[PDB]
Design a protein around this ligand. Structure first.
Ligand code: BEF
Ligand SMILES: [Mn+2]
Length: 128
């Protein structure tokens, strides 16, 4: 994928945002910004330029499922890649996010290898 692709990393835990940012850096992506909840994320997205979202689920203000749904329903960002990265492991959680339009889904804890595999799976699906 284009190494200038602009990522938004969304999680309410600074530790997890730091994990994902550093993994993205290793993969060659340095155009990375962070958001602390779904509301903060939408403000950033509204500000423009983003080409990929990685999001947690359980967050205050607006959770990741609502964020996903919002993005998918918005005509300005409907096809924006969204990878869910969440401690929600239940099949009904994965179904709800899949059906809402998740581009992929990674369960915490995850390895560096899993994140790269699931990112690449999305890049290939979208011809990126
Ligand atoms: F709080 Be997240 F769904 F890991
Ligand atoms: Mn969380």
């Amino acid at each position: 994928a284009d190494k200038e692709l602009k990522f938004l990393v969304v999680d309410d835990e600074s530790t997890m945002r730091r994990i994902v940012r550093n993994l993205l850096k290793e993969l060659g992506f340095n155009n990375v910004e962070e958001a602390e909840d779904g509301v903060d994320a939408l403000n950033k997205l509204q500000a423009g330029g983003y080409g990929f979202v990685i999001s947690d689920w359980r967050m205050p203000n607006m959770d990741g499922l609502e964020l996903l749904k919002t993005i998918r329903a918005d005509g300005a960002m409907s096809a924006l890649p969204v990878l869910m990265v969440t401690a929600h492991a239940k099949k009904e959680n994965i179904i709800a996010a899949a059906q809402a339009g998740a581009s992929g889904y990674v369960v915490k804890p995850f390895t560096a290898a899993t994140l790269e595999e699931k990112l690449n799976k999305i890049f290939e699906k979208l011809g990126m």
